[PDB]
Design a protein around this ligand. Structure first.
Ligand code: HEM
Ligand code: HEM
Ligand code: HEM
Ligand code: HEM
Ligand SMILES: [C-]#N
Ligand SMILES: [C-]#N
Ligand SMILES: [C-]#N
Ligand SMILES: [C-]#N
Lengths: 283, 146, 146
């Protein structure tokens, strides 16, 4: 993830911020509340008026956390554990808002470090902030509990030799429903019932069968598959939630009595995990 | 929004078989059972521990129908959901404080219900016309935010 | 997108102090340096191995004036971004094969560049006006995808 060169660029830039960390934090928050108002729903109790006293306070606490992160850059997850339980478990903040804050943090830094905001430093800072987010967004809906393990098997098993058949139907439902995904298969004949989609559809379900078989160690199992997507192709992460929704609709259209709320929830948790495995190497 | 006469006839066609009531609670209960955190908004109901607690809880059902109703209403004014969901959009922002990014979870849960209760009938081209409809409704609900 | 008149007035006022040839080159150098995977689309530009090379690369600079030239147009026709970015939408979809999720990456880098050049003058309200602009531009440019 972060390279030694990256660590160095961070430490230096944050070093230059210095005693202003406190005020830059209140500014990033204000900019955010102003550019992305939907974020305000997480602070219904605060006084978000300009120059507010409550905002000056939280900004400093947010700043102290980045200093903690910058100071323990080698073990981010450790030093930020409590901060993670809070945003994930207590607060329940959707991961998409971390991208909005980080953004307003970089904008603040850029406007205050004229000489320092080089493209190289801009790049190293954007990765750090993305790491901090991943860490505070880690322990959300996670872990395949033993009950899910059963569900995924008690359901995938009930697919059988109709796996390649369903994986092809998942792909078509995605291409039709979400047209932008075709930007990854431009040379294919994405037409209904094509041999490309069918020949490809069986591979997806074969890798999914394998993921179920190795449900407790997908990270090893899918290693070369994650390299393909995250590195050789660079598929945008959000696309994976599209392929996942479509597999659920297909699965649910073919195995109804078996698609109970309990079964549903577990397949959603499994597919969410598969996606993350193929995601990882992206940054 | 932009619906082709064909998909503006396919959507309404299949909805004419939708039991808004039972489907209203099938969708809402799953939201509560599939994306647990959303439960912090509905304690007003009661016991939401087990999926059996959820689907059986009568508050969830009762509310689920009030929701699939506004949805049906949005379907009568398919090309102006901003005006039909304006009030509700003010309610969810000011009173309820819901990050609009949740509106999308109900969208994918409802579609799955349509797939479950129609299987074969809920063909790929139908799904598509539906994806468009829920997205249009989500953007209407998130419209009055500020 | 809906910007107020004073927001419209602020955006344009500031755009006037902008040196398109200068900012366009830097906005694009940053995209390729900060989101290095997007350079997969610019293999023909030459050497893009070091940040020093990217920013100094002649093709990168030339392409940026074009990019920001399109932008000033979008700003010059703010009440119709779709009719201005239609050719461009069709091109990025059909000819180039760009996932529209990458559009937001460019807008992000533009805001950071404007902030870097304007510093203090790039106030929060002024950033908000601009956030509306780039979200509108990316939306119009992602319209002819099919
Ligand atoms: C780079 C990511 C972030 C960092 C480093 C961060 C840091 C912090 C810190 C240090 C606190 C103080 C917690 C305490 O004193 O117990 C906190 C609280 C909180 N954060 Fe974050 N946070 C981040 C992103 C977010 C986002 C994106 C949201 C939602 C927009 C959010 C919402 C909140 C809320 C609602 C509180 C508590 C407010 C209260 O005291 O009632 N945080 N955060
Ligand atoms: C549920 C997650 C997914 C799984 C398990 C999966 C699995 C696979 C597998 C097994 C291959 C075949 C490897 C090969 O021999 O080329 C592959 C290739 C590929 N995947 Fe995925 N994939 C998933 C999601 C996605 C998504 C969402 C996209 C983009 C819409 C994507 C785009 C591609 C492309 C473009 C290729 C290469 C096709 C080619 O060889 O021309 N994948 N995928
Ligand atoms: C996206 C589709 C949605 C629509 C159209 C919708 C519709 C409704 C309707 C019609 C009501 C009843 C309001 C009345 O009394 O007149 C309501 C209430 C409510 N909605 Fe939504 N809603 C949606 C999504 C959500 C989501 C995703 C959440 C939160 C995760 C949410 C949370 C609430 C809450 C907390 C209430 C209050 C119920 C109570 O009194 O306890 N809604 N909604
Ligand atoms: C954010 C809005 C965007 C605008 C305003 C924009 C604008 C433009 C313009 C003006 C051209 C025309 C060049 C010509 O016809 O001679 C172009 C070409 C192109 N754009 Fe974009 N673009 C956008 C986003 C993207 C993004 C994010 C990518 C993907 C990383 C991208 C990749 C390309 C490529 C590779 C070309 C072809 C360049 C060539 O001729 O080699 N664009 N774009
Ligand atoms: C953090 N707010
Ligand atoms: C890969 N689909
Ligand atoms: C209302 N859900
Ligand atoms: C486009 N650059």
């Amino acid at each position: 993830m972060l390279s030694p060169a990256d660590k160095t660029n961070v430490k230096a830039a944050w070093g230059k911020v210095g005693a202003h960390a406190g005020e830059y934090g209140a500014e990033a928050l204000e900019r955010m509340f102003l550019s992305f108002p939907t974020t305000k729903t997480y602070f219904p109790h605060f006084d978000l008026s300009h120059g507010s006293a409550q905002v000056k306070g939280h900004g400093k606490k947010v700043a102290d956390a980045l200093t903690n992160a910058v100071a323990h850059v080698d073990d981010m997850p450790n030093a930020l554990s409590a901060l993670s339980d809070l945003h994930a478990h207590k607060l329940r903040v959707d991961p998409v808002n971390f991208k909005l804050l980080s953004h307003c943090l970089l904008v603040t830094l850029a406007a205050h470090l004229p000489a320092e905001f080089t493209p190289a430093v801009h790049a190293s800072l954007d990765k750090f902030l993305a790491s901090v987010s991943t860490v505070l967004t880690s322990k959300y809906r996670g872990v395949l509990s033993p009950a899910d393990k059963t569900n995924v098997k008690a359901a995938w098993g009930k697919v059988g030799a109709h796996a390649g058949e369903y994986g092809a139907e998942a792909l078509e439902r995605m291409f039709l429903s979400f047209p932008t995904t075709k930007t990854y298969f431009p040379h294919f004949d994405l037409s209904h019932g094509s041999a490309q989609v069918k020949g490809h559809g069986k591979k997806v379900a074969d890798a999914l069968t394998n993921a179920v078989a190795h449900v407790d160690d997908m990270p090893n199992a899918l290693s070369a598959l994650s390299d393909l997507h995250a590195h050789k192709l660079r598929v945008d992460p959000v696309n994976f939630k599209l392929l996942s929704h479509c597999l659920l609709v297909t699965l649910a259209a073919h195995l109804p009595a078996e698609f109970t709320p309990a079964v549903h929830a577990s397949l959603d948790k499994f597919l969410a995990s598969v996606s993350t495995v193929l995601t990882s190497k992206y940054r | 929004m932009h619906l082709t006469p064909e998909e503006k006839s396919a959507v309404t066609a299949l909805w004419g078989k939708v039991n808004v009531d039972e489907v209203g609670g099938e969708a809402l209960g799953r939201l509560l059972v599939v994306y647990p955190w959303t439960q912090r908004f509905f304690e007003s109901f009661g016991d939401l521990s087990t999926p059996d607690a959820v689907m059986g809880n009568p508050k969830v059902k009762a509310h689920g129908k009030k929701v699939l109703g506004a949805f049906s209403d949005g379907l009568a004014h398919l090309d102006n959901l901003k005006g039909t969901f304006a009030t509700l959009s003010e309610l969810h922002c000011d009173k309820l404080h819901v990050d609009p990014e949740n509106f999308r979870l109900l969208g994918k849960v409802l579609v799955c219900v349509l797939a479950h209760h129609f299987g074969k009938e809920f063909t790929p081209p139908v799904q598509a016309a539906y994806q468009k409809v829920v997205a249009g409704v989500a953007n209407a609900l998130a419209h009055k935010y500020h």
